[PDB]
Structure 1
């Protein structure tokens, strides 16, 4: 028919489902009846979720929820960066960084944007100096103030509350989902129904007419949102939309995870997520309050589930026979089309990639934002659907490419896994970026180096999600550098001379913040 969408049914009630319910409930408030169908699942351990800055500005701010309100109810901690440990040295899976060129084998991928100097990213000046032997300091320590304060577990905020850097959050997803469930049902009028989908009825146009549950209830709506996770109950099962496996770019498809109690008083809390390289994958460490979530993401192609359990438990000194563990098999890739007919997939039902760069939750609300932007009426204009699908496919594929580069450019050749990664091919779009990088060009340089604008305007960030800063942190961090300095620098003697103070400013902030900032633990004590 025609007329606006009157009823929406969300199938699936986890993080994605209740985020969808909250975002749509907020966006269409009072002009659409929303029902979320939810069936009980086997409970799992809170193994932790890491996020990015726009979670607050693009999601919680949109809902009208203050950082302090949701943080306290979700027992959240702070994330200032992802610390990559042992990606450049051979060896077993260990929590301790090995030695590399006189220092621990780690590098940071921090938030924020590299400063521009005479229209050129600081990255280019750093490399120019490194290349000409004027420096041996790593890219991250030279261009970011964060590495130094993170090495000392400092808080991203002073005791008086003032923030000194861009940061995100670490939390148990289950708590956020419960928080949102209460918010959506209590504040936004979303209807929660506890039932299991038994049958999906489609019409002759291939659209979903209704969903019938195991109790015999029939739920019809104008638009259906699939938040059923890997099963893709609607988008794949009912709509039969093909899923594109991308194991030709990503070898990791499994994980063994758990949660470990932690004495924050004795050891403090790390203001960062750790990405610890393993023999057949990598392990995440996500610090929360009084405990940390950790999971070994690996490739079933190079390690059996039991070998992964052993490697994982031994690294944390846990009993492989008694430790509570979540054994997961991921569905890596994306649907050929995220939205088909009147069925929009949101969450893992849509796409999934290992949490190497904290994009899981981002993918959920980035998509919800794109859905509302391309919101249809009952005629389901195909142009809205196609453009939405294009945005989603690009969002995922760029991430897929970026993550693959973490493994493709690691210098490690010590296990079949690391060696195999180098035998895969990068997508053409990614290879073009590397060609540009090697030629000394910036990759997706931000329009402005103003981080407040970037993280404060979703449209601005979504169009430049993976920017030059991100690419340099990871590529240079791993050891991939340009074949030679940007040739235009040889024509800018005054700029390459005055940049001295730009590097000096970072050094002063590194020193000042290190001497004045409280530890993350200290701040959390006062705060929570």
Structure 2
């Protein structure tokens, strides 16, 4: 028997306990699993947003019903990120300004799928009408019924819990971590050691053989997962793997965050995350029951901590001297290699970008999924390690480029921060996609439909034509001209008009018949 016998996970939180719970299921109790977690002083729950495959890819794999975990972490529903004031100058404001053409400066990035007509996505029929002066509608409201539902703050399910739209989740990440810790310990025989690490013991090749704890106990293991956060205590410190700083692609490196009590009954509950543009970054709004989490992400080369705190405070009318804040400096980028020898980094110890498209928990599940797939024995086949590393770096760099496009194509030039974004080099992959987009062509057509988007189908097709249209057109970047094939296809244009009319009918119907997000949440948590 040459198998891995013991896996030691360094660090708790969502990364450590997702890893522990997932491997507990994937390895079918043939492996001992140990989590070494230093006890931590609780932080205020500033909220976390996610993407729709979290339930299918992670909680269902574990056999955990959606409503069961939701009720343990104050979770709410998310149908999109709503971007506010990314095109107009001025101070941070929760309220959207008005563009010069009279439109309000908001656009949505929903999870809905785009239909097509004659194998051409609905986005392209919209762009043709918009460029030809035949519609004044925005892309998001023309092409997604979800837009009208979000404008009315209606829920993504009926009260009888029948699904109406696709959606993901807002939640308190420390409560999810605590939920998963309890599951892993009581249902999967994970050993939880509450102690600090003092020594990393290695063999002549630099493979880790054990971790020593502060109490002096030695935790032997065969494979070690670094979930220690930005410090990368195993992968960076002990293993000396270099971290590749990518602040030449993304400027924001800091956040100041809190949780704000919210009057849900007076204001309702928004079924979406808001990304509120600031002078030196952006601020997230993550509604939950009774409160929303909020954090100002900024570059400390363009705002001091006090400047960012005061603008964040003024955003919500908070007393900057009488409110509890969490401050953090980010590490933006990724390790040269995510997995070195018998040390696999997961979460922030592996890589990080700001949560501008809610990908943080996804990077964790994707890594643990790829680890289970590439799971080694004690010979540590270097091809397994290399293919794992290739997957992590391509996943990360692709989302990094997608995020840079949010800043590079914002029309804002009113502060040093917004101008500095346009002095950055655009990655070649986005330059290529923008050139494709501007010729009128689709960008990364999706391959499957609602259901399959099957973890592999989504991992390989992560940002598709719909996503690039949401961000490019939302920011005001248009194709130079319509897709030229449309000029030859009068019947396909007519067929797309009927699709536009179906989107209107469905959104109208659902806006009238759905319960409020507030009412669905009261029932779910009541």
TM category (shorter chain) comes to over 0.9
* 1:18 to 2:28 alignment: no
Note the alpha carbon deviations across 1:264-291, whole angstroms, 9 max, x for none. Answer: 1121111000000000000000001100
Note the alpha carbon deviations across 1:78-137, whole angstroms, 9 max, x for none. Answer: 001110000011110111111123232100000022112111111111111111111121
- Which SS does the other structure have where 1:235 is aligned? helix
Look up the match of 2:29: 30
CA distance in 2, matches of 1:216, 1:524: 47
CA distance in 1, matches of 2:204, 2:490: 69
* 1:48 to 2:47 alignment: yes
CA distance in 1, matches of 2:25, 2:408: 42
CA distance in 2, matches of 1:41, 1:71: 23
CA distance in 1, matches of 2:432, 2:375: 33
**Deviates further, 321-330 or 479-488:** 479-488
- The Cα of 1:493 is off from its aligned counterpart by 2.0
CA distance in 1, matches of 2:519, 2:195: 45
Note the alpha carbon deviations across 1:237-288, whole angstroms, 9 max, x for none. Answer: 0110000100000000000000001121121111000000000000000001
CA distance in 2, matches of 1:437, 1:220: 53
Look up the match of 2:81: 82
Note the alpha carbon deviations across 1:281-324, whole angstroms, 9 max, x for none. Answer: 00000001100100000001100111001101111111111210
Note the alpha carbon deviations across 1:30-51, whole angstroms, 9 max, x for none. Answer: 1000000010223211000001
CA distance in 2, matches of 1:130, 1:96: 26
- The Cα of 1:482 is off from its aligned counterpart by 1.1
* 1:489 to 2:486 alignment: yes
- The Cα of 1:420 is off from its aligned counterpart by 0.7
Look up the match of 2:120: 120
Query: Which segments of 5 or more consecutive residues in structure 1 lack a partner in the other structure?
Result: none
Answer whether contact 1:75 1:289 (CA < 8 A) is retained: yes
Match of 1:512 among 498, 506, 509: 509
- The Cα of 1:384 is off from its aligned counterpart by 0.6
* 1:500 to 2:497 alignment: yes
Answer whether contact 2:67 2:524 (CA < 8 A) is retained: no
Look up the match of 2:343: 343
Answer whether contact 1:3 1:377 (CA < 8 A) is retained: yes
TM-score scaled to structure 2, two decimals? 0.98
* 1:8 to 2:7 alignment: yes
Note the alpha carbon deviations across 1:299-354, whole angstroms, 9 max, x for none. Answer: 01100111001101111111111210001101111101100100000000000000
Note the alpha carbon deviations across 1:217-252, whole angstroms, 9 max, x for none. Answer: 111111000000000000000110000100000000
* 1:427 to 2:427 alignment: yes
**Deviates further, 77-86 or 430-439:** 430-439
- The Cα of 1:17 is off from its aligned counterpart by 0.3
* 1:317 to 2:280 alignment: no
Note the alpha carbon deviations across 1:48-73, whole angstroms, 9 max, x for none. Answer: 00011100000001111110111111
Look up the match of 2:224: 224
Answer whether contact 2:440 2:480 (CA < 8 A) is retained: yes
TM-score scaled to structure 1, two decimals? 0.98
* 1:462 to 2:459 alignment: yes
CA distance in 2, matches of 1:480, 1:351: 30
CA distance in 2, matches of 1:308, 1:526: 37
Look up the match of 1:414: 414
Note the alpha carbon deviations across 1:188-217, whole angstroms, 9 max, x for none. Answer: 111000111101112121211111111111
- Which SS does the other structure have where 1:287 is aligned? strand
Answer whether contact 1:227 1:345 (CA < 8 A) is retained: yes
- Which SS does the other structure have where 2:444 is aligned? coil
Answer whether contact 1:29 1:188 (CA < 8 A) is retained: no
- Which SS does the other structure have where 2:400 is aligned? helix
CA distance in 2, matches of 1:344, 1:190: 18
RMSD of aligned Cα (Å): 1.0
- Which SS does the other structure have where 2:257 is aligned? strand
Note the alpha carbon deviations across 1:378-424, whole angstroms, 9 max, x for none. Answer: 10000011110111001111110011110100001111100110110
Aligned residues: 524
